[PDB]
Amino acid sequence: SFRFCLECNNMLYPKEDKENQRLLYSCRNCDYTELAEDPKVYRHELITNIGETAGIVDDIGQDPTLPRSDKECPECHSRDCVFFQSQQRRKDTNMTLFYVCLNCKKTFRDE
């Protein structure tokens, strides 16, 4: 996550002080400068799993084309649920199922 300038709404690029030895987020369109909280400047994931379970909506139980199972809900122990596979559509994607209860509407696995 990256922060924005509080006065002109531009991006806050990180900057390093030679004399003070501190990491600071500074806007290049002004003189505003705010002290950085964490040193994690950049992170790149070669193999990522985000978007696998992130594709979830709160009204997925009203879809009539989705199959319905009788798996046990971990939270409220309901007897009706709706399952589907991974929303990510790469070639390496697993065939595991995500179950959605019809009362608490949370996503849970079978393992």
Question: Is residue 75 a known part of a binding site?
Answer: no
Percentage helix, strand, coil for the chain under 3-state DSSP, each rounded to 5: 5, 25, 75
* Cα separation, 63 vs 56, whole angstroms: 13
- The dihedral through the CA atoms of 40, 42, 45, 49 has a sign that is positive
DSSP state of 4: B
Question: Could you give the string, one character per residue 91-110, with x where binding to another protein holds by CB under 8 A and - elsewhere?
Answer: --------------------
Question: Is residue 24 a known part of a binding site?
Answer: no
In the complex, what is the shortest distance from the CB of residue 108 to another protein, in angstroms, rounded to a whole number? 17
How many amino acids of this chain bind Zn ion (CB under 5 A)?
14
Binding residues: 5-8, 27, 30, 73, 76, 101, 103-104
Q: Which residues are annotated as a binding site for Zn(2+)?
A: 5-8, 27, 30, 73, 76, 101, 103-104
